[PDB]
Design a binder for this molecule. Structure first.
Ligand SMILES: Nc1ncnc2c1ncn2[C@@H]1O[C@H](COP(=O)(O)OP(=O)(O)O)[C@@H](O)[C@H]1O
Ligand SMILES: [Mg+2]
Ligand SMILES: [Zn+2]
Length: 568
């Protein structure tokens, strides 16, 4: 041809080729922003039979992709506001002129395919036209951000064995992923430099995250306006370094941060991008920047399509990053190669740890001090990465995962997520299954809240809002026993007993108490006598509610509720 592929580019091509020689279904490739997505595009098109349509939502993406294609010495058409195998188009423009797209189309590539579900509405008109004309039309997505915290995952199965999204995902498969780690190790991107000790960080250890997992507009703009005096004190140091840098990208937390920054540095040498802007004004600021007509770009919406020019060489991070994906997306905005760019200066000011390579758990943290931890599935061996708390030594205090995420395929094409359940109910189903996939048969499972309300309107019933438990142990002519006593904030209490002597009794005790009560399900608790259990009571959680029925004379435990989540 006219071009030569790097090894990783040929991997991405062969991955795609193998997927569609076996499957009709959509696939995504995960490529960082400096990878040269045009080299994959051009090899697929050299091999294609139809034409190939390369769609973007953002017209500047359509123009960037058309330019980078023809920079290879190749011809292709473009369809936007104003001949070869490939057509480069925007969603709006192509959904308009569908009559001009009536030939053979074998492959449709969607750049930034994470955008697809951001309503838009014309896209599926395109999809259905192309599929009417081309029933076996193959669709490849490309993206650097498969997962946005708050929107979830763009694919379902990953070819490494994890499951990510539900049956809902737009792409059933992710078939190649190029790690930042590797692109930096082999020099295909600019190596990043995070200043070891920058002077005055913010104190975002006060993290009050919403349920989708994103810190709220209010909580940000307010909650550390207690330090809103340091907002000029830090831009001073940013200007210090920017003395010797071509383009600085600064990421605020809110418009109330980004404006209180855009005024605080030089007077017309900076600009402000956020979703609340034109339009024609963004089309002016994309020409001004990258052409370097100003220096500082301040933004709060990290979607920087157009401003990730190669000349940017310092990323200053003025916001806490909830997921690692947001951190990686932000640093990656400044990692492109430029002739004589030695590194990219990363200024981590907020409470943002040092893991450009962290695994993305893929769900909200929960407790703010939660880190990723890896738990091995006792069924299939797969290495899950759940949220957890780990001690100084790297040892596991808690992990929070509920189900193994590995998957497998037989030789009949039937594909299944592993079904090992770290948290369970009954005899077993997910903590939040409505119907028992299979037992007490397909019956309707009793919702915790209803079970508590039923038990409340019983007289022979006790319902204690458990504030903790205490263990005693003892012995007689049949061996040892362990007695657990649950109690609420007023010392109302109720207890149960477990003989530890016989192997059936040992086994029942692992079944009915250690497995519900352990903080590290899947990692077995090692113990010889009740004394070892007392010794390890920190590895045990206490129930959120206990229900005891009456007969006879004494109170007898019947139900324990863990992992509550619905108030009350
Ligand atoms: N196979 C290749 N042969 C020659 N140059 C390449 C190759 N792959 C990538 N490059 C160069 O590496 C850089 C890739 O950056 P870019 O084209 O901006 O990535 P993307 O378009 O994927 O965002 C470009 O400067 C490009 O010319
Ligand atoms: Mg490219
Ligand atoms: Zn498993």
């Amino acid at each position: 041809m006219i071009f030569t592929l790097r090894p990783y580019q040929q991997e991405a091509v062969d991955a795609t080729l193998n997927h569609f020689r076996r499957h009709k279904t959509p696939a995504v490739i995960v490529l960082p922003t400096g990878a040269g997505k045009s080299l994959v595009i051009a090899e697929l098109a050299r091999l294609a039979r139809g034409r190939v349509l390369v769609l973007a939502h953002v017209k500047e993406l359509v123009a960037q992709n058309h330019a980078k294609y023809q920079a290879l010495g190749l011809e292709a058409d473009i369809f936007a506001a104003g001949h070869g195998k490939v057509v480069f188009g925007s969603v709006q423009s192509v959904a308009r002129n569908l009559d001009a797209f009536q030939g053979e189309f074998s492959l449709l590539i969607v750049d930034e395919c994470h955008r697809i579900g951001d309503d838009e509405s014309q896209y599926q008109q395109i999809l259905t036209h192309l599929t009417k004309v081309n029933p076996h039309l193959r669709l490849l997505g490309l993206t650097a951000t498969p997962f946005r915290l708050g929107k979830g995952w763009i694919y379902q199965f990953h070819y490494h064995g994890m499951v990510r999204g539900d049956e809902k995902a737009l792409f059933r498969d992710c078939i190649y992923e190029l790690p930042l780690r590797y692109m930096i190790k082999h020099g295909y991107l600019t190596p990043p430099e995070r200043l070891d000790m920058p002077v005055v960080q913010y104190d975002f250890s006060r993290l009050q995250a919403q349920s989708n997992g994103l810190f709220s507009e209010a909580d940000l703009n307010r909650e550390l306006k207690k330090q809103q005096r340091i907002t000029p004190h830090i831009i001073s140091q940013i200007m210090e370094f920017a003395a010797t840098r071509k383009g600085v990208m600064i990421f605020a937390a809110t418009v109330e941060h980004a404006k209180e920054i855009v005024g605080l540095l030089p007077a017309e040498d900076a600009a402000l991008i956020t979703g609340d802007t034109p339009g024609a004004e963004r089309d002016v600021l994309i020409e001004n920047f990258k052409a370097q007509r100003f220096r500082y770009l301040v933004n709060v919406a990290v979607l920087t399509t157009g401003f990730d020019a190669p000349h940017v060489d310092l990323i200053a991070i003025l916001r806490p990053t909830e997921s690692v994906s947001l951190y990686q997306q932000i640093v990656g905005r400044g990692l492109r190669l430029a002739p004589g760019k030695t590194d990219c200066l990363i200024l981590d000011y907020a409470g943002n740890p040092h893991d450009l390579y962290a695994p993305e758990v893929g769900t909200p943290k929960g407790k703010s001090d939660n880190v990723p931890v890896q738990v091995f599935c006792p069924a299939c061996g797969f290495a899950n990465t759940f949220w957890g708390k780990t001690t100084a030594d790297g040892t596991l205090i808690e992990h929070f995962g509920r189900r193994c995420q590995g998957w497998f395929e037989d030789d009949d094409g039937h594909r299944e997520q592993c079904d090992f359940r770290f948290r369970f109910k009954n005899c077993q189903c997910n903590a939040e299954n409505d119907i028992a996939a299979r037992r007490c048969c397909d019956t309707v499972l009793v919702d915790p809240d209803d079970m508590l309300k039923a038990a409340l309107r019983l007289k022979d019933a006790l319902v204690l809002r458990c504030s903790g438990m205490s263990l005693q142990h003892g012995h007689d002519e049949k061996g040892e026993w362990l007695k657990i006593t649950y109690y609420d904030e007023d010392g109302a209490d109720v207890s149960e007993r477990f003989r530890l002597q016989t192997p059936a009794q040992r086994t029942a005790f692992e079944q009915l108490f250690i497995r519900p009560h352990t903080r590290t399900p899947g990692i077995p608790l090692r113990w010889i006598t009740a004394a070892d259990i007392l010794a390890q009571q920190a590895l045990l959680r206490h129930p959120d509610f206990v229900v005891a029925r009456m007969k006879g004379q004494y109170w007898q435990v019947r139900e324990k509720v863990f992992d509550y989540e619905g108030r009350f």
